[PDB]
Amino acid sequence: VLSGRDRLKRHREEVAGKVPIPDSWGKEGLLMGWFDAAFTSSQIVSARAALMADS
Amino acid sequence: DKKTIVWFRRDLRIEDNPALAAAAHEGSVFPVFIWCPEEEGQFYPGRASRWWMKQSLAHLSQSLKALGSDLTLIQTHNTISAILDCIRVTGPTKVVFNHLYDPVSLVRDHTVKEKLVERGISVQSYNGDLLYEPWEIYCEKGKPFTSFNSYWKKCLDMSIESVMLPPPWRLMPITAAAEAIWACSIEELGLENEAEKPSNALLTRAWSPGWSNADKLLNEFIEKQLIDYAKNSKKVVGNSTSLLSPYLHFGEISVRHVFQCARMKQIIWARDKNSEGEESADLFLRGIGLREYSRYICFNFPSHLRFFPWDADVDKFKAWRQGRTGYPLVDAGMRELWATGWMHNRIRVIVSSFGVKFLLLPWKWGMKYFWDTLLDADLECDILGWQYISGSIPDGHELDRLDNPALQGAKYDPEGEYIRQWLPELARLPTEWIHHPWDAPLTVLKASGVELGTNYAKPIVDIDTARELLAKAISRTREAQIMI
Numbered sequence: 234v235l236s237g238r239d240r241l242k243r244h245r246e247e248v249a250g251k252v253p254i255p256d257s258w259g260k261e262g263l264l265m266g267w268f269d270a271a272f273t274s275s276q277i278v279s280a281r282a283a284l285m286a287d288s
Numbered sequence: 289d290k291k292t293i294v295w296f297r298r299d300l301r302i303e304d305n306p307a308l309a310a311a312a313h314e315g316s317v318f319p320v321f322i323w324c325p326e327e328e329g330q331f332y333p334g335r336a337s338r339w340w341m342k343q344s345l346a347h348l349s350q351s352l353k354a355l356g357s358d359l360t361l362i363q364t365h366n367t368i369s370a371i372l373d374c375i376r377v378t379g380p381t382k383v384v385f386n387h388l389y390d391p392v393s394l395v396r397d398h399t400v401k402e403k404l405v406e407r408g409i410s411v412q413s414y415n416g417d418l419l420y421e422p423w424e425i426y427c428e429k430g431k432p433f434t435s436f437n438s439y440w441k442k443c444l445d446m447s448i449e450s451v452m453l454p455p456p457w458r459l460m461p462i463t464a465a466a467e468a469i470w471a472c473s474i475e476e477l478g479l480e481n482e483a484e485k486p487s488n489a490l491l492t493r494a495w496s497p498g499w500s501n502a503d504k505l506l507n508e509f510i511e512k513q514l515i516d517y518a519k520n521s522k523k524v525v526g527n528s529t530s531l532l533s534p535y536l537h538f539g540e541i542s543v544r545h546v547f548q549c550a551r552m553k554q555i556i557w558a559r560d561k562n563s564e565g566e567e568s569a570d571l572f573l574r575g576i577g578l579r580e581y582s583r584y585i586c587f588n589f590p591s592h593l594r595f596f597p598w599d600a601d602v603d604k605f606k607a608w609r610q611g612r613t614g615y616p617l618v619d620a621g622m623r624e625l626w627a628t629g630w631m632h633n634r635i636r637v638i639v640s641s642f643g644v645k646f647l648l649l650p651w652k653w654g655m656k657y658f659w660d661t662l663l664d665a666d667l668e669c670d671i672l673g674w675q676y677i678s679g680s681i682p683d684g685h686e687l688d689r690l691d692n693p694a695l696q697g698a699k700y701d702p703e704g705e706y707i708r709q710w711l712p713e714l715a716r717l718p719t720e721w722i723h724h725p726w727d728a729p730l731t732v733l734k735a736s737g738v739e740l741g742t743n744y745a746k747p748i749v750d751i752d753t754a755r756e757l758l759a760k761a762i763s764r765t766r767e768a769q770i771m772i
């Protein structure tokens with residue numbers, strides 16, 4: 234049995250220089266579409282405040 | 289006696305797990321993992337994270353059986369409804385979990401707590417993931433600190449309020465029929481798509497998820513590697529940093545245990561007047577502190593690139609994704625990222641600012657690619673990282689900072705061994721040129737077997753042209769927001 238650090242070392246040495254990055258990613262079709270109002274909702278303000286109160 | 293549901297999310301461990309400890313201290317426990325893709329929305333996890341999570345859930349499942357319980361898995365359309373059904377079938381009177389700070393989880397955790405409370409169920413959440421809650425640190429008038437060094441200086445002038453708990457002797461089971469709550473196996477969660485298995489074969493050989501593998505990794509790092517971290521962490525190849533990030537992200541190792549081990553080594557080395565060791569521990573603890581800081585800025589500050597004239601060129605995106613930029617450190621990094629699901633922080637800095645500053649690619653594109661390929665993909669650490677390279681954060685890179693590859697190479701890969709490992713086409717270049725081969729005398733390129741355009745790509749943009757386009761880009765960003 235070998236450690237994580239040494240398992241990563243071995244794999245790095247096996248695959249380095251020898252693995253092509255695929256020509257297609259799979260999300261190309263989403264690129265042009267790519268919001269951040271996730272952090273400013275009224276709901277999140279209420280939840281932040283609720284979380285502080287319960288601590 | 290008392291019956292409590294223990295809702296796991298990003299805390300896939302037994303040691304120092306506060307919600308699990310509190311539930312086990314009160315009676316019998318029903319651990320469950322509830323998967324609701326529709327509720328994750330914009331932040332549904334990527335290929336690499338989902339691979340890791342799947343391995344780690346099976347690991348945790350095995351750990352909970354050996355303890356005399358189980359892990360029930362539910363893929364649902366609604367987290368409230370799945371929890372309400374677990375309560376109806378098992379008869380428990382309380383739900384506990386470790387709270388999270390990302391906007392999806394904050395809102396959902398708030399929605400669960402409000403609904404359970406009105407249905408007459410006790411609920412409590414616990415700090416499973418931080419040394420300092422994001423509201424515990426504030427200045428002299430009581431406001432956020434807005435700077436890492438100031439934030440961390442203030443944290444070291446306080447003590448940790450978090451209290452580590454001992455592990456349980458046994459877990460008293462609560463059993464429920466899989467059919468009465470619409471439960472399923474780990475494979476029925478759909479964490480891994482058929483088309484992903486070929487990519488995920490690389491991550492399988494490179495990593496073993498699971499809390500018991502985290503403990504092994506933390507012990508080997510503390511006991512044999514922390515001492516040299518101050519030096520190792522300044523190189524991007526080989527044995528550089530701890531490799532703890534995927535495990536910290538999934539809660540497979542408690543950050544309070546990381547800090548305790550590293551701080552106690554620091555105190556030992558202070559007594560041995562082993563100053564290099566004290567520096568290492570100090571630098572490593574500063575990394576932990578960046579992670580605390582990432583939660584702190586995402587919880588307290590509710591975007592200066594708003595009007596930046598991005599060049600939405602899907603072709604130069606592909607060239608960045610594939611490592612066909614012609615900048616060795618960048619092209620090595622994207623190869624390492626695809627084959628191992630991880631890269632050194634400085635290679636993360638280099639690769640990302642190359643996308644933004646040299647190519648003017650929209651930052652959301654590089655973030656989304658990171659989100660799909662990093663084992664440790666973590667919303668708050670990733671936000672802070674892109675803030676840092678984009679000048680959107682007090683003490684980070686300035687937006688007009690165009691790093692010179694020749695100097696990055698000399699600082700972070702001074703032997704060139706990072707280039708020689710990931711770009712063997714370049715390995716015969718004298719290390720003086722290997723990080724910017726386009727500046728080498730044609731006679732040196734030829735003696736070293738490098739032919740730009742045929743076996744290693746020509747620079748996809750010239751640095752002197754990139755600096756001009758970046759200065760124009762910044763002018764128009766600032767001209768425009770004054771105009772709007």
Ligand SMILES: Cc1cc2nc3c(=O)[nH]c(=O)nc-3n(C[C@H](O)[C@H](O)[C@H](O)COP(=O)(O)OP(=O)(O)OC[C@H]3O[C@@H](n4cnc5c(N)ncnc54)[C@H](O)[C@@H]3O)c2cc1C
Pocket residue numbers: 521529530531532533534536537572574575576577578579582631632633634636637640662664665666667669670671672673674676677
């Ligand atoms: C653009 C960019 C994007 C990033 N995206 C992620 C991500 O998705 N998930 C993630 O965990 N980290 C991210 N980071 C920071 C990341 O933790 C380091 O870049 C990387 O984790 C090194 O892994 P390690 O465990 O060996 O680091 P070590 O230095 O050995 O350990 C320090 C531990 O403390 C934390 N830490 C260390 N450095 C940082 C840092 N700069 N910022 C925040 N936390 C830190 C991490 O939990 C890390 O595992 C990003 C950095 C940048 C510049």
Ligand SMILES: Nc1ncnc2c1ncn2[C@@H]1O[C@H](COP(=O)(O)O)[C@@H](O)[C@H]1O
Pocket residue numbers: 435436437578633634637672673676681683684
């Ligand atoms: N104030 C900070 N805010 C966010 N990230 C930081 C900050 N300082 C350092 N980092 C990270 O730490 C690394 C080391 O910074 P430096 O000492 O300037 O080279 C950087 O490349 C970032 O990834």
Ligand SMILES: [Mg+2]
Pocket residue numbers: 529631632633634
């Ligand atoms: Mg690193």
